[model samples]
Target chain A: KALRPDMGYNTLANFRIEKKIGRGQFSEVYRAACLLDGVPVALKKVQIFDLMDAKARADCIKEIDLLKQLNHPNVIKYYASFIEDNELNIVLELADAGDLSRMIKHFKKQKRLIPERTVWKYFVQLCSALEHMHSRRVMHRNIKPANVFITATGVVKLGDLGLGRFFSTPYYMSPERIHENGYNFKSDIWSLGCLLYEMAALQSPFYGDKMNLYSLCKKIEQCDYPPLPSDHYSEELRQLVNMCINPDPEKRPDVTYVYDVAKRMHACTA
Target chain B: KALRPDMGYNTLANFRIEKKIGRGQFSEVYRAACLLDGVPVALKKVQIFDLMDAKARADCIKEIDLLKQLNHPNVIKYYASFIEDNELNIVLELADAGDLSRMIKHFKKQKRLIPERTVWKYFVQLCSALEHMHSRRVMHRNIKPANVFITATGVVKLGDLGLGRFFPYYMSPERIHENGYNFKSDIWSLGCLLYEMAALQSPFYGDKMNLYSLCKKIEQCDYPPLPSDHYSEELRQLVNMCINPDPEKRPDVTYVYDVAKRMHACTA
Candidate 1:
């Protein structure tokens, strides 16, 4: 999403845009600084032209409201949202290391494995933020590596609630939500598991080129995955991964169980 | 692991120990009731003679303390601990329905599968309890289906943490003694039990054989076979992730959210 000159960035006029940090399907993130406070931050700009549907517009506004209410170490801080030249600008926490996707790519390029302790550390931080959000009855429907941020010291922050809804993704969604059609805190746990799996393996559990909506739904309905490569993965990690992807949503463990499983899994191999 | 002569079962003389409800490698769980209050409870008796070394004994004591500090609906409630006749007795919540293994067997015998709702309900209960326990820094190392109890209302309760250890089995004895155990052991057990429950399958033929083979397989870093027909593709993928050969790469229970998303058509 880009900012429209007609909409005016005057609401964020005090912020000086520095450099582009990231670009994605929906928006572009920038490294910016607050003109008044002289503090560095991230400014995500999205165009609210005729391209976005009414639902997307409403969701964006709702996201802005929700982000403003959250304040936690594992959550990306939101400063302000303004309309400039028909484009939406959202100010947020500056994660110098960028999102988890970039981090994973960097580690892969360096041939550096994600240590169990490091994974556990990030998992714990993500859970802390998720638990907080769930406690407030907010569901982060879209949780992926790209939506998660890493601080320089290895702290993980959950971000990008703009696409979030009261629903979960088909591939990672639990069976109860499929049958009963509702979601709560447990939905987020499903996404966390998927994110972790991708982080560790750098691969998506669901992979297919001819995937259509119905086919994707059908695959998810089956709720089964291929075997992990034993040459690289560990049993403890595998087990924890299984717990998260359990087809039955209600059967899926909660955030706390996630912490316990991750910790014990790390210990078993430590 | 057992109590001294003075701290024997006589210390809690008001409670009458009934027949043994279950038995494991190092402990025996029994159904008991208080003679004074007539309250029904479960008593886990750890035989001091069963422990092989001083470290095992310390682990037993640590498990008792950890269980006492954990309070959750999915977890078996710990009321108190005492020594009786050189046995460490831990009082706990008793469920009318036996372990989940028994129920699964019964269901399987009837050629009937457990309903998805039932599985979901119990899983939710277990996850909530686990969350509570993890919050207290306690890990139920032995999380097999046999350790899970089904109440009359179909709720599940995780039990028998007395033989649990705070350190990973792979750690050196000295290092284990120093650092204590982490929470991952519970996940391994949970994964094992959940797989068995969902598929109505077992790891191997016999419990003893399975336990030995399971440990060996884990050490060898081989994954157990998945229940192919019983699980959906997404679910199978999930199981593979859980039973991944690498403990460090496993997804915790919270990752269930991703599974939930896939099932519900939500974002991930």
Candidate 2:
């Protein structure tokens, strides 16, 4: 269906755009307030240049549908979506503290690693989000530090489903993803491993600035990464990373097991 | 457009209906909880048996549109709406304490009138709600004790836009004769509502009055006045000014609000 008249929400009349917060390949995100109620929200405006292409419009609707179906504490809330002036605007919960990637970068600039307890908290929340998505038969396909958002209350939420496919950052991609083989939920586990390692070590687990994309892909294929330091984190944390980063997708534990492990770690650290 | 997919909200997946709370001419309201977060909500489900008729669908959409446009502390909040299985479900804020009519009835049963200060508080809130609706160029054609809701926190809210046009016993004289009423009509209904709260009975109502006689009484603006000692003189005067037969002679909501504000200040 076309986005405009069919979409139930009144986009233009309800929300007043305040400022641009982010931009993606196909959409621009803005900080907006609902004009009627004044609730703060993030509006992702996706412009469709090809109005006649049906498949492209359906893909946009699919993303919106998936976001609507997902409702978890650790998943970004989808409020509404409507088309205005040939642009599809999706209303989402505003994350005031920005994404985890930005937080990690800030910590790196300050020359300090994220605390292990804090790492476990975010890790468990992300795992909860993934478990919810998997239960609904939807794979995030793209899970990285950039897609995980931190709310003002310090809660981590998974977002950015527009890139939920084989296309993602090379360092976070699993081997099967690079080989164009059909990937499953385990692919997201590999990305989560990279994300967790970066949060603790302040760098990607598989590659660094010195390595090129070819080397990065080779390292992902070979499951090559420096071992987690014994001094930095608990054995459970290190073992969890190693379990998720395994090159064999079949060898990786499911999201529920990872969530249980992280939950236990969070409790011990607490 | 087909209602189910076009409505854009996943009604069945998101909400679990707890119990039926109310029923109206074309809708049934239920208490529901959000399946994901367990937030309580009221779901007003309107069913259209004939899917091919476009007018019925348009009218339903119009009501939803008006509700979505309204936003005020005294107005009921609209959360979301979706269509499933030929039923259009509109999610709304759950007002736990029920309507003003029930509260008035309870007071009557206890052989006491509602406290004047509480009445003033509720009246001011309803006036604010009407003023907000007027500011948006929308008129709440139906304003009665039954349509005013009270939340668990004792907050007053206006609801039910389905009877916005003509289906109301609380209509002004001008409305009864098909003379076309304006915002002043709502003021008359508010006056009737206040009279009900004070007397525990409708103003233009009789024990055995028929519909024709009731219509005639409303057309002539004939109603028993509040006894002098029954309420404060200021309240009596305010009610009199609101129920005047001449619509032009009736004070607007702003003037009424100021008077109510002054009375409230005096009491405080």
Candidate 3:
């Protein structure tokens, strides 16, 4: 008898890939669907050439482990992972709401800040997901609008801790891990600061000067943040951002503090 | 009318600070002339309040212990550190050449890798300094272009090891990798320095979310470089050897000597 394959790809083959969702040097993401369940999913395929080496393969395996352990409402859910014909594939929940980067771009086209309700709702949900990850001894090092997924209902899901680490970004990434030589859950707080900065300003906090890895590393270590457009953002929000983005990891406020400050700001406006 | 001093102005006038050379959160470095020899020197003045908290003060004071124990040509020369009028100041050799960041940026703007001759010239010098520090059981936790300086004659001198430890940067931030964690801390720094020169680009620490986890713990846990970029392959490998994520995997400063010697043979 022919050997029965432990992993099947029928469900994967059923869904036609409409277009590319994301692209990286090693992998690509597509909007796919399950024919049987009539459910949509994000299919992330890592090229065989990309994982030709032992280290890259190991990194992929590690990513699988990382995605498997995470579960949350506001977190993008990982469904399954398998290797077939030298291809490594990861299937996850797909949000029709599109990515935060697109949303930010759409809002920027209108020349306005993300709506206050939209910002608050998404911010709180992202924080909730981050808090959950931190509780499990996890740190999401890469937090940008692109990695954030928004549902049609305006619910936000924080996904892809792919580059998350327990320490710094090669050069001027962050101080806590660099300056003090390590970090724990508080790293999420730093990321939150970056996310908030992008949402309010529609720009990356670390931009310009080539933004090369080395220069960026130096900037992070030096605690240099690009000046925000003061005319647009409020003073209270600005202060919160300053505290969150503080070079000293110890000085950055925790998630609880973030919620409290945001809550106060929300109440003040109400 | 008597002149009123601003709060930020220095009260102690013994050592006349000529001009600001570099600045950091905890300290400000000034190019000053020593009253005794009229020799120009770098004076790093750290505010007491910056390190007023116990943890901050301890880390700051530890710099003295670290500098006292470790010395090298590439390592910044430590002269003396003293406290006066509620301020802490350290006097040391001033590198007329300037910090590595400036040098790297200059090369980058010119769209060039540090000429192979210059890369090896500095690589060996850095290895010597790192070897010296690791031999003394000290790790320069923070190693970046900013922390490494060059003299006018092109002699590379490592500076800011103490501040490197506390001051955060992308390369050495949060100690995710185990490289140089032992006596090889300088090796890790060397790797960072070499990377800066080779790529003329900053080190890759993924996005803010993935930086801590991917760059620091996973990717950095061991000194490994992405092999795709061939321009800095050898330099990347050298840095990887120095900053292997596993502390046990890191080569000792002495062994690093052998490797650096061999690397020089091949690169030269």
Candidate 4:
């Protein structure tokens, strides 16, 4: 159902917003709790004013629909959604350990790369999530480190499907997507390859020698990027990353294949 | 922690067991809610004194361990387990739509078989659960209608893994004879469950049959035919293969799931 812009505040009285966790252009996420049970949840409050356009409203509803239909351990859980005070409120499972971007930042601040074993763990989980999504005909267009969340129990969850379309951070978009050509599941593989490179190198692969967005996009389009240095990483990881970042989307391995290889890699490290 | 016999209250401090939903010889199932969240949950409270025997305690722990490791949409979600006042409490996701047994009873009360489409829906979900469990080396040994739950959203979940070893009516032939059984045994139970869903009665059931007679029939793998006029040939064939006496002949969950998916697609 489409979210009604004029919902009364009393409708969302069951959830008590405790603190603001993050904010985006059109939405603000809060660390909230159920008034009835006190169970913590992530309350994504979207400003309805921004969704006054019918297409934007439809997209928001589509995001909610996708969240509800998905049921996988590595995907963010959707608890409930409602509208109140010109805001669309979506209650989600709280990823207490925060997003992968934050985790990477933490490691960077400590002047260390995330352990290869942990990277493999997160990679496997993300691939599993992508497999589930692709099997269901849903493409998570946004698969950046910030959208990949980690739970307190060490489970990685793919989140933030609100921007499940072409709109995403330019750095994470596949070359095909950047070229304004149609893209599919393989585009996610390319994005994940970039994510894997960043997890190991603590920097985006395409960010090398290209500070400007135009130059970065050009480099990505030509599939020109810094390789993961062999000194600190294995050739297998480098090969996998190269396969994922292949400019030809069709040439990139499917999520199932990626998952199988990642599973083996994880096993080896373990 | 070990349960304290000296503790007085029936209540778990963080949870209030509002009322007993079901009970067995050694345990009581309560309809409970979190004290803090007020979210509903099913609380299976086992009497620790009855489980004082080492084997019984170990079995209970095994069930808890299995629950913790499993993560599937069609499997019951385990929240937490703790020992309190002479009891071991296991909290689970509440299935508001109740069990498949209740659904079958409802259809029987109406004097009609469940819609084939709905049956396919439930079967596919059960297969998904079995697939997940078997992949992880866990087995839902007891897979009768009573243990197959439906949530308020109509999602079917496989539950009640605690009594995995023995439940006579749904038990496989090997299990009944005290012989070892593996994941294939669960497939046999799934076959029985499918038959029940279609006919509103178990395949091996007879008029006033005693436990002894039932055990004999189960061991012999003797079951009644699906009434030709009431069921499609494809469904009947599927059930026949699942209930095949030889465990080696029974198809794996993945193959069964593929067949179920095809059936669902055709029906839809």
Candidate 5:
């Protein structure tokens, strides 16, 4: 919608606007095709405004540079940025199969819990992304299931790569983030734990239909969530969530350690 | 920290970089100052790998045009831009502290309802900014809490301009169907913006819902009402008027601004 609906062809980076995908951070993403190669890509039209001070503007520019260096199966790919019709067009890999947050909700609607195997499959891929992203010194401040992209082939692609946003949805935030305890990548692991818990429990660890900030904070600080149903999932999987959601971030295992466990756990599922 | 500490004496675009204050993913930003303004400004510089295609190199020049032409108090001012040593330096006005994202987070972390007076202060500025942009016949396409920023003086400035993107949650119903569209579409967004200021969350929010369901919700004009005792009905009515299902019924920016200004008039 940045360009006129009729005056679309040239304003876009030679890629005709196919259709609107969804709203991005400051960008309106479109499901587009590269007119030259016929390859489809997620075209993010990032609008940088003059009203934003240099720090905020640079943070977005930071996101682009951070997204570019990443090259992994689990990590969302960052293609070149070009100025087409005076617009900043950031072309990215397309993950069309929807995201994990919605999928979990759908299963909740069907009244069926996610199988342990499927949870681990998703977890293993997410761990791969977390492991690799940590290697680059980049922490996905927000790592909720909603940010987890699933490709059609069942490959998990981690996105929303710190796109100038800070502390999105609190359900995924760690105790340290809320408690003002100076957190790091470990906070990301806590968020990952919440996502894992939701995959099986069909609800967030610290969230309810009617909950306020004070109550939400107390529960998270206490690592308080309902116990995973033992009959439906293994004690080991439940134990993994416990480990990841540990209130003492110091006690939490690193992504490297968790990745090894994730792979080992998925080994049985496959 | 791409700029070596020893290279402090280096000057780009006549503004000597005082110190490396920050850095983007690619560019190294600095708190720089010059003799004319004698006030600090932001200089964001990018390094171009000269080993690129001829047309590609020429394309970088086009970026300058995109940076210029905007002049407004609410708009971040692009002071100057130039190239030297295969690097492009863009000097711009600086914002101290952070943006609306930080502002909302502050209130949320403290468990507060943003004061009604403070809310109107920002809302009026945003409406003014939107009125100006709409007057120019350029729709921002995206306007949300995250894009709005506050300066040290508490002046609100709308940001995130260089990119074009979406987020359906704030998207108007007509925009959802790709049907009849006009400047009023932004009024729908205006409602979403004002709602967040009062409510501290998105008016049309579903973390668990997919795009299909979200689209239907927006199309239905489905949203929770703000607290009656917490916020005045005057503010609540404004939100409803902006997010009307029918775009034709929505008021234009001038009318929206008038009401917002009047609402703000009493508080000040």
Candidate 6:
């Protein structure tokens, strides 16, 4: 269940700002506690009208809208909201284990590839989240490593749905979505393909110099990513990525189909 | 001040389900109170665990941590929350009269203009509420006639404080299709409210206009001008200023408040 509207919170005054966690474009995040019951919360303090431009504020609003209605095992839980110190404080579920981006970075820096079984474990759950949203007619406009959070129990929570014109990485965009054409669940599937590869390879499939936007787009448009080594990982996993990143949106497999494949692979444990 | 943690009820069993007042995607709102106080309270019951385990149940309680901070007479107040019958119950302050939407519908049916004085009366009070929230950096993301309520003494109470997360209703031009909007977004809704008060209809009321064209018109700021004969020149201009296509050009709450205040005084 998502956060109910009443939590017996007094005001922003009641929340004890403990430590700063992180921040966003015009907002700073903190780990705080309300004096009532004293549970830890992820507080996102946004400078709601004073500093943020109209665009940034709109995205934040969208984020709140999506978060409140969204209740699932793999989605971030929204706690409450408040206005204090001339800032908008969003109380949220604290994911103490950091995020998937950090996990990828750790492997990258260590020059070690993520184990195949471990990748499948994450793939099944994250796909479960994507399937949940798509089935509800909700499109996760932006999905990337940073937005996919990890809980203390090795659970992955998908978040940051208020990505209005906020593109943190180009690898997550399907060509149709990138060009502003008619895009749908297939577009999100394309991004999931990139993410799945990231789990195994510890790097994006369409990789090269991050400096050249044109080169990256060319590779993306052509679906010209290097294949995962068949000798290392299962051919089934390779096919999952291949079909998901199909150039034509119509040609891509449905999210349910993709999720089912991961589920079966997880159950079979090969 | 907001609701205290200690309330007279322990579970859903203590409160009777008087009636369902409203509902959202995953929850039902009701008019009920604890058997203890016998006072009327708005209760929203949500099947929080349609999908929860032990960890999930713990997370569900964490979601109930929103503290009531808004203490203005012009805003709806939340009283308390409880978990009963495997459902999440939220207790809130129930206003005396109905919401602003029904009042406007009543005026529309009469085909009579909302009187200039009464319009400004509601206008200024609503502005007071908006200014109060904006000053504290809270944006009522879903500001609309329905979200605005009425009190026993004809006092207007702005509600559904979409402080952290709310839905979209009266979206500003910039807010459509996600350009981004700020506190200025709420200002746009206030302008719509002011116009609705004067015109007895939404400024962008399109009988056959679909969502797409309606949004385009809002982006164009192309609504019918309020009849100058009925309203003061200041009212019309203030509406235009709030609905300004450029959010930067939109008047702040302070400016809108001052203008409405002047208009309210002049009406008398």
Best of the candidates, lDDT: 4
Local error of candidate 5 at A63, Å?
2.7
Residue lDDT tens for model 1, B1-268 = 4333333223556577778777666777778875533557778888765554778776677657556644444667665677767878777767757778798899899988765445655665666667656644566665667677877646677775445442232221222235333565455555555566676864333455544565555555454565456555665566556554455676766565345334433211
Q: For model 6, what is the alpha-carbon lDDT of residue B141?
A: 66
Candidate 5, A1-270: lDDT as tens digits: 343322222246357677776685566877777564455667787776633566776666655654554545577666546555545677775555577877888898898988999889989989988986786566777787767877655878788732211111444767777768566889888888888888899888887767888888888778778898899999888988999999888999899988888899999878
Off by over 4 Å in 4: A1-270, B1-11, B48-50, B161-167, B211-216
- TM-score of the first chain of model 3: 0.69
| Ranking, DockQ, top scorer first | 4, 6, 2, 5, 1, 3
Please tell me which model should have the higher TM-score, number 3 or number 4. 4
Instruction: Score candidate 2 by DockQ.
Output: 0.04
Interface RMSD for candidates 1 onward, in order: 21.8, 8.9, 26.2, 16.8, 15.9, 14.8
Candidate 2 segments whose C-alpha is farther than 4 A from its true place: A1-9, A18-25, A31-33, A38-40, A49-52, A109-111, A161-171, A181-183, B1-86, B89-268
lDDT of 6 by residue, B1-268 (tens): 2233233434565566687777665567788765644566677776668844567556545544432444444666555567767787777667647777888889888887888898888888888888766754567666788878887547787766222232255657776758775798888888988888788777888788688888778778889988888887878888888888788888899898888888887887
DockQ values, each candidate: 0.01, 0.04, 0.01, 0.07, 0.01, 0.05
Q: Tell me how far the alpha carbon of residue B153 in candidate 2 is from the true structure, in angstroms, after superposition.
A: 26
Q: Give the CA lDDT, 0 to 100, for residue A243 in model 4.
A: 94
Tell me the tens digit of each residue's lDDT in model 2 across B144-200. Answer: 887899876466888863333422667577866678868888888888888888888
In angstroms, the error of model 2 at B212 is 33
Best by DockQ: 4
lDDT of 4 by residue, B1-268 (tens): 3232223122376566687777665677788766544567788877756745877777666656555445567887665567767678877766767789999999999998888888998898898888877865677766789889887647788887344342255757786667886888888888888899998999888898888998788767788887788777888888988887788999888888888878887887
Ranking of all candidate structures by their lDDT, best first: 4, 2, 6, 5, 3, 1
Per model, how many backbone clashes are there?
Answer: 88, 0, 52, 3, 26, 6
How many pairs in model 6 have backbone atoms within 3 A of each other, for residues 3 or more apart or on separate chains, i.e. clashes? Answer: 6
Worst 10 residues of 2 chain B by lDDT: B1-10
